[PDB]
């Protein structure tokens, strides 16, 4: 898997509320997290299928 799923989920410096998916390496799967709308990191997926296949 790429090194960018090493990162934990990243809520941006913005205050929207988008449900997204991020790969918990410790837990070993992408759980849903709160995306603020701005400067998304690469551990940030719109659906859990794209996150499992992308990590």
């Amino acid at each position: 898997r790429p090194d960018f799923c090493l990162e934990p989920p990243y809520t941006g410096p913005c205050k929207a509320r988008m449900i997204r998916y991020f790969y918990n390496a410790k837990a070993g799967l992408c759980q849903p997290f709160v995306y603020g709308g701005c400067r998304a990191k690469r551990n940030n997926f719109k659906s859990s299928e794209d996150c499992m296949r992308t990590c």
């Binding site: 941006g12 410096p13 701005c38 400067r39």
Partner: protein, 37 residues
Amino acid sequence: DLSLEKAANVQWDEMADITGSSPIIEVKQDEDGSFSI
């Protein structure tokens, strides 16, 4: 597909809490509208 819902009219509060600091952070925005450092 998004829906709306009424919340409030725009009026100022005589009965408002006063909080917050007034720092001076130099920060630069980037094309997308973001902010950092």
